[PDB]
């Protein structure tokens, strides 16, 4: 417990060296008081969401709404001492957020409790601390009992915690409310009237004479206007308010395209000396919601192009981070967004700061539910006692923000149709108006949706509430946008939520069918914009509804950014864990609808040709072009494919917009696919080109290239850098369907904060060093530490080339000065006897996140370096500074023949890859075409092993492969017809005579009124034990599935499960790859068990309902075969043809130390009866080679490792 670092700053950070322990074996007692022994607990930096670190639990009580991530009860502790500089002055402990039902103790005594989860709270700490210099013990209990939210919320102290140190006479917690009343009339005279109301708290023992000097500082730091009030008495232990009026000449208005802000420094002066200073940043802006003309900031009309964000930050969970929030706000700004509607909870301070800096409006929303709770442990349980406090808290914190434009009171609240609902809405609006009368109140109501076609007749109480609030928001109720305006001309309307469409990144299924709330077998959603929820609409529908009406202030499309939890279409699928709504996935990679909204809402020209170009030959593919230009023509491999265009239309009041004759806002073709390059050139009205975009067919995966958004970051310990790892083709084209496992290694002055790929149906933990790519991309987040320097990230995919990227970390002081931070390294890969190339200029990065190419002088490269296979470094010098450049060259290629092996059946050639992997003795894994020798059927028939020769095209050497044989030959088809046989004679444990078992393979299903053909074990007595069906074949062929068609009636019910077993002539065994879908009634089914020796296949059934019987109509099995054999474990292992010293079956690794500089050794291995063995000879000086063995048909396996090494030089 190190003492708090205090340097006179008013607010002291408090995130350092906390402790944590989550309850797992019941309540842990004694954790409240200082006497607890917490030396065994884990240490962590405070902004911390403990739920994201846990792995996904299928049985979590937060089922499919919290994302299957557990919360629970967690304990925090911190031991600290207060320096002697802080003695004798007021100290308060400020939390920006603890998720729910928090109870904080200090020195063993209860300090308070704050049920709400998204609001800051504070406690007065000065009296409780120990002034003896001994150690204090702050303890925070967090009780996030599970079913407490409709979306992933996180758990624990997920926002910053501060200490506020101030003189006994100080500005109050939020004791400053600077406003600019009547700005619209004033600005015409080029003058803003500023009114400042500051509240001074006097916690001293006696009244004192208090004076205030308030000065307005410009954006650049030069004084604008300073005013000093008149001294007035300040009674002890009370808040005494002041008030001042000033002016600003030629004020710089805060605006979306120019977010200027001022800075007010309030100095409290007692006895002719400053005693306390307070800083609040405000802005000079005025907005209006007109019932006919819509929203308008200052004098300019504009639409509220908005998105409905959540607080979850994706890979790093609910834990707040300034850079991550700013990054997602920058992406949303890049989409053309004007406003953010913080969904169903107040905003974090970082979000408001990012909105104020970037220039985005904000709509703060206080509650998701009033006293009528939506989940058992939701906040409605606490609403009656804490609603006033929480709404006042939100309005007080946010009153000074220029970004905020409205206060929302609720969203889809079930008791809004009752008299108590009107009463509590009136209460809430009154409480909001008690602090901030300069912004309208708002409510989000969905019950007006009705049939979604005609103007719903509004409920009486809903009308009352709509009359109480200043602005009315309509969720998914586009059918009332103009009806309610006509019926109620005084209402100001906007779309609080619209177009709840679903979409996965890079998924293009069902191109021409528009579905509603449909699940799919792959647990994905179509990115063609043909998928949306039942109550929602396609993005185009909502945008067209909003665009046509002047009086609609705008809309806020749903979810903006994907978030964890609420995979609506998949209401109970387990792998489905994250939303599909967002226009940008969880990792921050835009989907196609991102570019649709870019075309619709932005002004500058562009074009996006969405579907990737990796399809099968000759199949027509629907290609769309989300563009705002008036013309587009496709040029497939140089041949123009035709030109499509818009019509320059206009709305009723004269707002230009572009649309086709059909009424579609996007251009569309239907092209037959052929590999190559597909290019779209966007041409304006006169034909001038104004934008371009292309999609080119990708090749086989080649490497893993890393891109870093910000190459220079601060060394403040929290600045993040986001690294885009995407599998690429040899030409540098992202493979559109790659899903390889990327392994990240981060070393230097930083650490891996998290990884993600944006997949909504993956249960890969976010806090790990590896992540599967999804649609050819994956994300890695690295956060800097307190030490300046460099962060080096290394990514590697098995069978692919690696890549390394550098992130330079500089001190905060240097970030404001233009000095060199570092020079990026160069990575090159060449073949043997290939001279590597060195660029004439390379990029040098300064401390101000800027800078570009600079001249360099490279040192000589000798022929010896690249004339042989190996790895070496090349160094140079840049002309700008003394720092040494560096280039890494990898020289690898044809060294030795590559080994391969396979197994197959008798008379069937093995499944040999038509693209051989050229894994020479260097570590490189290039791929190339191979023409295998025609394997005679005579050799396949003969038992044993044989070698085959593979002719690789364009290589200096030829490949080889080994083979194994089994059973008998077969054709591709399953079966045409059986003339007659004893095989189809089925058997079962029990079969009613009237329900002959043979019907299950007769082929005629009897779902409908057609003649009954079924098996049924019906009896007069219960048969809850179950029954099994048996089939037999004499074949020697492949199997891939087990079909099940079920029969049901008053007596017979569907099986609870279908366990499948196989008979090999000796005993029964379990099959692999069952994959039994979920239960059903009168529906078809299939189990996907893999090919297995199935002399007899028997699967057992049990009733789904006790006291009810079992029945079936058809079950399909096809073939049979025999196992390879009872092969034993490894037999021999040798290195360089010599026995490996230290080898032992009871040792994990075998170490060999050759003389320094010796050639890498070669490895050979074998197993009993030629059991399959994976052989990987060593290729690199460091590391250790590994081998694996496969035997028999069960779990028998073993790993053999050979630690090649050498002695000292």
mmCIF file of C-alpha atoms in Angstrom, residues 828-834 836 864-873 888-895 921-924 1160 1179-1181:
data_model
loop_
_atom_site.group_PDB
_atom_site.id
_atom_site.type_symbol
_atom_site.label_atom_id
_atom_site.label_comp_id
_atom_site.label_asym_id
_atom_site.label_seq_id
_atom_site.Cartn_x
_atom_site.Cartn_y
_atom_site.Cartn_z
ATOM 1 C CA UNK A 828 11.636 -8.615 -46.834
ATOM 2 C CA UNK A 829 11.341 -12.196 -48.082
ATOM 3 C CA UNK A 830 13.409 -13.370 -51.061
ATOM 4 C CA UNK A 831 14.641 -16.627 -52.563
ATOM 5 C CA UNK A 832 18.139 -18.095 -52.610
ATOM 6 C CA UNK A 833 20.642 -16.034 -54.624
ATOM 7 C CA UNK A 834 18.115 -13.165 -54.784
ATOM 8 C CA UNK A 836 17.049 -7.999 -51.434
ATOM 9 C CA UNK A 864 27.343 -14.019 -49.224
ATOM 10 C CA UNK A 865 24.282 -12.916 -47.245
ATOM 11 C CA UNK A 866 21.565 -13.826 -49.762
ATOM 12 C CA UNK A 867 23.478 -16.403 -51.836
ATOM 13 C CA UNK A 868 22.493 -19.075 -49.278
ATOM 14 C CA UNK A 869 19.252 -19.938 -47.512
ATOM 15 C CA UNK A 870 19.033 -18.203 -44.156
ATOM 16 C CA UNK A 871 18.054 -15.075 -42.246
ATOM 17 C CA UNK A 872 20.031 -11.866 -41.785
ATOM 18 C CA UNK A 873 19.632 -8.194 -40.888
ATOM 19 C CA UNK A 888 15.132 -7.799 -42.142
ATOM 20 C CA UNK A 889 15.600 -10.197 -45.069
ATOM 21 C CA UNK A 890 14.471 -13.835 -45.115
ATOM 22 C CA UNK A 891 16.179 -15.933 -47.803
ATOM 23 C CA UNK A 892 14.519 -19.340 -48.111
ATOM 24 C CA UNK A 893 13.534 -21.741 -50.869
ATOM 25 C CA UNK A 894 14.373 -25.050 -52.530
ATOM 26 C CA UNK A 895 16.704 -26.962 -50.197
ATOM 27 C CA UNK A 921 14.193 -27.533 -45.103
ATOM 28 C CA UNK A 922 13.960 -23.793 -44.378
ATOM 29 C CA UNK A 923 10.628 -23.107 -42.635
ATOM 30 C CA UNK A 924 8.921 -21.655 -45.727
ATOM 31 C CA UNK A 1160 20.494 -28.195 -38.589
ATOM 32 C CA UNK A 1179 14.419 -25.710 -39.333
ATOM 33 C CA UNK A 1180 15.390 -22.849 -36.972
ATOM 34 C CA UNK A 1181 18.335 -22.460 -34.619
#
